[PDB]
Write an enzyme that holds these catalytic residues in place. Structure first.
Site, PDB file in Angstrom:
ATOM      1  N   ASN A 164       0.826  -1.198   0.000  1.00 31.00           N
ATOM      2  CA  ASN A 164       0.000   0.000   0.000  1.00 31.00           C
ATOM      3  C   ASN A 164       0.862   1.250   0.000  1.00 31.00           C
ATOM      4  OD1 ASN A 164       0.629   0.987   2.713  1.00 31.00           O
ATOM      5  ND2 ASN A 164      -0.609  -0.725   3.481  1.00 31.00           N
ATOM      6  N   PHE A 198       2.822  -8.648  -1.218  1.00 30.91           N
ATOM      7  CA  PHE A 198       4.172  -9.163  -1.090  1.00 30.91           C
ATOM      8  C   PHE A 198       4.198 -10.462  -0.319  1.00 30.91           C
ATOM      9  CE2 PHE A 198       5.055  -7.678   3.236  1.00 30.91           C
ATOM     10  CZ  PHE A 198       4.136  -6.680   3.402  1.00 30.91           C
TER      11      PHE A 198
END
Length: 163
Positions: A101, A112
């Site tokens: 983000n 991720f």
């Protein structure tokens, strides 16, 4: 039961292997559903064919920018960036799947995979899954990374949901 999704990873077009993930739909249903639907492509867009654009060994592999391929794009299945759903789950070690983000309440499609414990991200990035099979493939991917995140070779060749 929590859904399981798979990515088939390719390096410069050559097959590498498969990584699967358990999504924690029991704890972060909105965030899990976004990733699940982007993995099946059922909304008409998603992760198939996209790349992992930032891989930093000893830290994480980041992907999901299926619109700009470089960390500046992506979108959720909700027509706008969406809120941080909760921070119940923590970044406890390798294999944790968490949202990328650019500030509070700005989740899109980027995510991720941790390859180390990243506790400083607790309360800042929403954890929503974990690698089930193929952590070894994530470790193979990691070797193609570098300190600044640039990869020395180029993808999610296929992806979807497993029973």
């Amino acid at each position: 039961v929590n859904p399981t999704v798979f990515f088939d990873i390719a390096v410069d077009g050559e097959p590498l292997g498969r990584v699967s993930f358990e999504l924690f739909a029991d704890k972060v249903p909105k965030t899990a559903e976004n990733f699940r639907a982007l993995s099946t492509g059922e909304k008409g867009f998603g992760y198939k064919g996209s790349c992992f654009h930032r891989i930093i060994p000893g830290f994480m592999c980041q992907g999901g920018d299926f619109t700009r391929h470089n960390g500046t794009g992506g979108k959720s299945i909700y027509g706008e960036k969406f809120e941080d759903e909760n921070f119940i789950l923590k970044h406890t070690g390798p294999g944790i799947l968490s949202m990328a983000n650019a500030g509070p309440n700005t989740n899109g499609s980027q995510f991720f995979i941790c390859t180390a414990k990243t506790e400083w991200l607790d309360g800042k990035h929403v954890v929503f899954g974990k690698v089930k099979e193929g952590m070894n493939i994530v470790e193979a991917m990691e070797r193609f990374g570098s300190r600044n995140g640039k990869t020395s070779k180029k993808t999610i060749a296929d992806c979807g949901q497993l029973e």
